[PDB]
């Protein structure tokens, strides 16, 4: 009973957060086995940030220029390399709190938990989606760089995001853990703009199913729609196209509620055309698009880690 934006328990990731210092710049690192991952811009001065030549700045660094701190303990750096926009610091000590893990690159619309950290100390946890324009709507201040985003599958932590920068209107950009940016962004202090964002239609439908599971039924209408007729209306309201793959993915939620996906689409089409008329769904006055179908099943069925 009840429905909440819910993060993964952060304990497995908290035990991996360290502080990385290079001269005057301090940010967060992820310590897995004997490697610390962090944003490469830890090596820049504010001067360098405008247009850094990262390969050139790193040549000028030595193992000893990297101060890595895990609580009270300094970790000795015995090697360093750059992969894309991340620095990999080889340390002489493997993290005893290393969980089972993998690095994954997520798709727009997929959700993940962020452990917000400052000076290598976990400060807060919240749930985000990769927006269709490859930004995230985060909460990050100066010091938060190297904070990571993740999912848990049972006891396996999938790292999908590392935080690098803030874009116009207070949205955020970062990389996967191989250091490749999500979206066309670069780690430089330079005018950059995200594309126009859109609503994650498959997620809105997942959340209408969550609504029915939780006893909110008012928006259910007597109609069905074709996928074509649905997309004609959705594109008019800056919704992502709904694919057959999306219809097929909503199948289990459809079976749970006895409401055909295209009947739920006809209900969404009416909400977009008519609005909600001052009414709420699951305590929201707008349609929520940061719950995946898996997130809804997770929460409504209580899967654990």
List residues binding ligand M9X (CB under 6 A).
1, 25-27, 41, 49, 140-145, 164-168, 172, 187-189
Quickly count: other Cβ atoms within 10 Å of residue 153's Cβ. 12
Quickly count: other Cβ atoms within 10 Å of residue 113's Cβ. 22
Q: Which is nearer to Cl ion, 266 or 287 (CB)?
A: 287
Q: Are 282 and 207 in contact (CB under 8 A)?
A: yes
Q: Which is nearer to a second copy, 145 or 247 (CB)?
A: 145
For residues 74 and 119, give the distance between their C-alpha atoms in angstroms, rounded to a whole number: 13
* Single residue of 78, 94, 232, 303 touching a second copy by CB under 8 A: 303
The answer to whether 286 contacts Cl ion (rule: CB under 5 A) is: yes
Q: Are 213 and 300 in contact (CB under 8 A)?
A: yes
Q: Give the residue among 294, 300, 248, 242 at the shortest CA–CA distance from 268.
A: 242
Stretch touching a second copy by CB under 8 A, among 52-60, 119-127, 156-164, 261-269: 119-127
Site size for a second copy, by CB under 8 A?
53
For residues 197 and 200, give the distance between their C-alpha atoms in angstroms, rounded to a whole number: 10
CB of 187 to ligand M9X, least distance (A): 4
Q: Which is nearer to ligand M9X, 189 or 221 (CB)?
A: 189
Q: What mask, x for binding a second copy by CB under 8 A, covers residues 133 to 172?
A: ----xxxxxxxx---------------------x---xxx
CB of 126 to a second copy, least distance (A): 4
Q: Which two three-digit tokens encode residue 135?
A: 């930004």
Active-site amino acid positions: 41, 145
């Amino acid at each position: 009973s009840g429905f909440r934006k819910m993060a993964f328990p952060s304990g497995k990731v908290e035990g991996c957060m360290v502080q990385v210092t290079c001269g005057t710049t301090t940010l967060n690192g992820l310590w897995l086995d004997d490697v610390v991952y962090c944003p490469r811009h830890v090596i820049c001065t504010s001067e360098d940030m405008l247009n850094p030549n990262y390969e050139d700045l790193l040549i000028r660094k030595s193992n000893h220029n990297f101060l890595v701190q895990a609580g009270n303990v300094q970790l000795r750096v015995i090697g360093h390399s750059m992969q894309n926009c991340v620095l990999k610091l080889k340390v002489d000590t493997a993290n005893p709190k290393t969980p089972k893990y993998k690095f994954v690159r997520i798709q727009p619309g997929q959700t993940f938990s962020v452990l917000a950290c400052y000076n290598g100390s976990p400060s807060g946890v919240y749930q985000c989606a990769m927006r269709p324009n490859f930004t995230i709507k985060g909460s990050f201040l100066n010091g938060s760089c190297g904070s990571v985003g993740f999912n848990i599958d049972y006891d396996c932590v999938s790292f999908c995001y590392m935080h690098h920068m803030e874009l116009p209107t207070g949205v955020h950009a970062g990389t996967d853990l191989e250091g490749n940016f999500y979206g066309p962004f670069v780690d430089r202090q330079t005018a950059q703009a995200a594309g126009t964002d859109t609503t994650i239609t498959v997620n809105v439908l997942a959340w209408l199913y969550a609504a029915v599971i939780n006893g909110d039924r008012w928006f259910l209408n007597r109609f069905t729609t074709t996928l074509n007729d649905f997309n004609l209306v959705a594109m008019k309201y800056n919704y992502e196209p709904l694919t057959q793959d999306h219809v097929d993915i909503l199948g289990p939620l459809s079976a749970q509620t006895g409401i055909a996906v295209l009947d739920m689409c006809a209900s969404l089409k009416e909400l977009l055309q008519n609005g909600m008329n001052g009414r709420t769904i699951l305590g929201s006055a707008l349609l929520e698009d940061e719950f995946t179908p898996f997130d809804v099943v997770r929460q409504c069925s209580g899967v654990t880690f």
